[PDB]
C-alpha cells in the first residue's frame, strides 16, 4: 500500500499491517510511497537489499534482542513526533532507539548467535545528532562509536554531527545498515552511544524467484 520496503522492514509505526506477513508470490510497491523512513536518514545499500528481497518469498520475524533486556539504558524514550503511532510520538518497531539512563550511557556489548538453519537478515542503525548538545542530552558520552562484528562483517561507525535542514521536523539523521547472518555465525555489537539497536530480525525462510513490482494499483482474483 502506502508503505515502502524500508518502512516495512524497519517497522514504521504507520506500517502495522505488515507486522507478520505471510508467504508472498511477488511484492508490490508504489512509486513514491508516503510511509518510508518516518525519522529522516538513509538506508545503506538499500537497492542491494531490495534485490535480495526479490529473490525471496518468506520472512519470519524473530525477536533477536528483547527490548526488556535493556536494564541500564532507556528503551522507552527513544521516540519521536516524526514517527507518530496513534497520534502519539513513537518509533520504528523492530529496532530500538536506546537513550541514556540516569545521565549515563554504559558501554553496550550484545552478541547474537544465529542458531537457526536459515540465513538471517539483521537491521541496525546509528543516530546523527544536530549538535554536541543534543549528543549529550541523549547519550551522556561526547564521542561515540558503534562496532559490528561478523565472520565477514567488520565496521565501526562514528556519528557525524552536523546541522541539517528539518525533514519531518527533525534535523538529525538516522543511518540504517543490514547484513546477512549465516546459520552458525554470530553478530557482535559494541556501542557507547547513538546506537539504534535491533530488536527483531528476519529469517529468510523461502528463497525463490520473485520480484518487486512498481505499481500504483491494489483484486481478489488469480
Amino acid at each position, epitope marked *: 500500500r502506502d508503505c515502502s520496503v524500508a518502512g516495512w522492514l524497519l517497522g514504521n509505526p504507520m506500517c502495522d*499491517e505488515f507486522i507478520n506477513v505471510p508467504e508472498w508470490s511477488y511484492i508490490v510497491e508504489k512509486a513514491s510511497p508516503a510511509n518510508d523512513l518516518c525519522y529522516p536518514g538513509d538506508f545503506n545499500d538499500y537497492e542491494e537489499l531490495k534485490h535480495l528481497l526479490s529473490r525471496t518469498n518468506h520472512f519470519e*520475524k524473530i525477536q533477536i534482542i528483547p527490548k526488556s533486556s535493556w536494564s541500564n539504558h532507556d528503551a522507552s524514550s527513544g521516540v519521536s513526533s516524526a514517527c507518530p503511532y496513534h497520534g502519539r510520538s513513537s518509533f520504528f518497531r523492530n529496532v530500538v532507539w536506546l537513550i541514556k539512563k540516569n545521565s549515563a550511557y554504559p558501554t553496550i556489548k550484545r552478541s547474537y548467535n544465529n542458531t537457526n538453519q536459515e540465513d538471517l537478515l539483521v537491521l541496525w542503525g546509528i543516530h546523527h545528532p544536530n549538535d554536541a548538545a543534543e549528543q549529550t542530552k541523549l547519550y551522556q558520552n561526547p564521542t561515540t562509536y558503534i562496532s559490528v562484528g561478523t565472520s565477514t562483517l567488520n565496521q565501526r561507525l562514528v556519528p557525524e554531527i552536523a546541522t541539517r535542514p528539518k525533514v519531518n521536523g527533525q534535523s538529525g539523521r538516522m543511518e540504517f545498515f543490514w547484513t546477512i547472518l549465516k546459520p552458525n555465525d554470530a553478530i557482535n555489537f559494541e556501542s557507547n552511544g547513538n546506537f539504534i539497536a535491533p530488536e527483531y530480525a528476519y529469517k529468510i525462510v523461502k528463497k525463490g524467484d520473485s520480484a518487486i513490482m512498481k505499481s500504483e494499483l491494489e483484486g481478489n482474483c488469480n
Partner: antibody, heavy 120, light 111 residues
Framework: EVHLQQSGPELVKPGASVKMSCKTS????????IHWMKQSHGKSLEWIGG????????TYNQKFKVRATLTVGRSSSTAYMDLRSLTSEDSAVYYC?????????????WGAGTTVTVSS | DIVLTQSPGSLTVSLGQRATISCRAS??????????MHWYQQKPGQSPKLLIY???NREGIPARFNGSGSGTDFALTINPVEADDVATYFC?????????FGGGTKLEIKR
C-alpha cells in the same frame, strides 16, 4: 492493524431474523473478500459465504443460500450478514473473517465472534 | 464435497513430547503441485487461529509446529509440546468448494 470489530451477542425468537455486523478497520476494505463462518458450539466450522466490498459480489454455500444474505456498506467500511427465519439449528457463533486472495485463498484475519441464541 | 476426517479425535500427550495429528481427504486436495490444506488452532474459549497454510508453511507461529503431508493425507506435528498448546486443532481444505473442515482434534497435556 487489521482489526475486525463485530456486533454484540444476540437473542432471537425462533422464526425471526438477525443482522449481525462486522466493522472493518486498518486495511483497504475494497481489496479483500470478507466471509462468514458458523461454528456449532464446540464442534465444527462451516463456511457460509463471501462478499467483495468494492462491487458487492457474493459467493454462498449450498446450505446457507436461502437463510443468509451478505451485504456491504462501502462508506461504512462494514460488512453485514442477515439470517432469516431462525431455528435452534442456527444457535451458534458467527465469525466475520477476512480471506486473503480470491477463490483459492486463506482466511488470515478472524474477527471476535457474534454469538446468537435462539430461544423463546 | 471433500470430506475431511481427522485422527485421532482426542490426543493426550506428555509435556515436552510429540503430538502427531492426522488428516485424511476423501479425494485429493492437491493440484498445481501444491497441497491446499490448512491447519487451525482453537485455544479453548476463543476463536480459531491460523497455523499452517497450504499444508506446510507456517503463518508468528513457533517452529514447534510441523506441517507435513501431500495429496490425500497430511499431518500436523507439534514437537516439542508446550503448556499453552491445549486446543482443538482443525484441518480445512481450499482445493474445492464447498470449503470443508475436519472434525477437529482436541489436545490434552499429561502432567
Amino acid at each position: 492493524e487489521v482489526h475486525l470489530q463485530q456486533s454484540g451477542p444476540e437473542l432471537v425468537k425462533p422464526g425471526a431474523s438477525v443482522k449481525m455486523s462486522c466493522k472493518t478497520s486498518g486495511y483497504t476494505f475494497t481489496e479483500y473478500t470478507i466471509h462468514w463462518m458458523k461454528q456449532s458450539h464446540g464442534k465444527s466450522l462451516e463456511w457460509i459465504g463471501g462478499i467483495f466490498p468494492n462491487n458487492g459480489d457474493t459467493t454462498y454455500n449450498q446450505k446457507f443460500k436461502v437463510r443468509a444474505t451478505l451485504t456491504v456498506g462501502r462508506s461504512s467500511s462494514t460488512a453485514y450478514m442477515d439470517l432469516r427465519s431462525l431455528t435452534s439449528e442456527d444457535s451458534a457463533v458467527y465469525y466475520c473473517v477476512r480471506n486473503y486472495g480470491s477463490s483459492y485463498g486463506y482466511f488470515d484475519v478472524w474477527g471476535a465472534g457474534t454469538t446468537v441464541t435462539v430461544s423463546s | 464435497d471433500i470430506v475431511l476426517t481427522q485422527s485421532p479425535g482426542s490426543l493426550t500427550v506428555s509435556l515436552g513430547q510429540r503430538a502427531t495429528i492426522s488428516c485424511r481427504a476423501s479425494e485429493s486436495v492437491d493440484n498445481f503441485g501444491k497441497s491446499f490444506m490448512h491447519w487451525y488452532q482453537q485455544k479453548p474459549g476463543q476463536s480459531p487461529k491460523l497455523l499452517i497454510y497450504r499444508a506446510s508453511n507456517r503463518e508468528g507461529i513457533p517452529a514447534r509446529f510441523n506441517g507435513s503431508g501431500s495429496g490425500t493425507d497430511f499431518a500436523l506435528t507439534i514437537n516439542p509440546v508446550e503448556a499453552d498448546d491445549v486446543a482443538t486443532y482443525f484441518c480445512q481444505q481450499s482445493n474445492e468448494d464447498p470449503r470443508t473442515f475436519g472434525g477437529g482434534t482436541k489436545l490434552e497435556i499429561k502432567r
